[PDB]
Design a protein around this nucleic acid. Sequence first.
DNA 1: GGTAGACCTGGACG
DNA 2: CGTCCAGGTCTA
Length: 313
Amino acid sequence: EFGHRTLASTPALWASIPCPRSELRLDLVLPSGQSFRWREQSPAHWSGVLADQVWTLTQTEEQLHCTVYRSQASRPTPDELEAVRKYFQLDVTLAQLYHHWGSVDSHFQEVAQKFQGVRLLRQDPIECLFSFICSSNNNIARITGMVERLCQAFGPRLIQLDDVTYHGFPSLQALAGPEVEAHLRKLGLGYRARYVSASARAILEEQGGLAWLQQLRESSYEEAHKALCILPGVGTKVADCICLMALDKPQAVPVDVHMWHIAQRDYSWHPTTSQAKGPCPQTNKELGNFFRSLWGPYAGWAQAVLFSADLRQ
DNA sequence: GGTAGACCTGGACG
DNA sequence: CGTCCAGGTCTA
């Protein structure tokens, strides 16, 4: 048996974590632009790297089926499945949050019907940092390719399924190496080729390496957000992403075009205390606060719910 | 402190 | 085929 597995082709190799489509919708999470490393190689079967390992994920109505490629084949262990639960944060009950945002908001309660199972992935800081550095002034379609080539170039080779080889996300040492930028431009990363190199070296030579970054999962949102921006290619929008998706700051509200349109069309929002009228540093910060008060401690997850709906719209 | 102007690039539209 | 735009950040 070769190629990517399916629930039908290789039943004996799939374990299932109990999970209803209301709690998680793969087709509304993985390609939604949180991670750029999941592909639907097979219909309803999403494959990608998780915890330095390849997985294929598919879901029924009450179960989420998982299969792992580690050299002996076997269904996922109890601990390997745990890695999956951690990734989708399956302890955070979406049904509750949905009730709360719908309870204190009407427009949400409306869109919160057609779009369920939209949660946040608990991503690794490094992968998330550099992935979202490539997102600025760019489209999800492009970003995916850039991150794919980036990983192929400087990422550890994992395994090969079909004509697809998977790579662990590059390390700081890898991204800081000589002539990385020159290499990354060949991969068409554009002006962001420098941002990656600079940030890799900045973190590893001026900040304290990996330790500095990871220790922001304990810091406060305000602390971490402030900490990130000093990195090249990292502004408020990019920082809010890293915080929200990797740094465990659920109140982080990434403000961008989509969020600014939604904040002008669906909430008729208007910059109260701001000299300007458009997306200037000031307003964007204020806009975020507005959602943090509206939706609360998890204004970030709520954003992701609407943001996803707006994409497939 | 508050502002446009630009950028690498690849896909849409007029 | 030129103008715009996409999960914006860095600049005189």
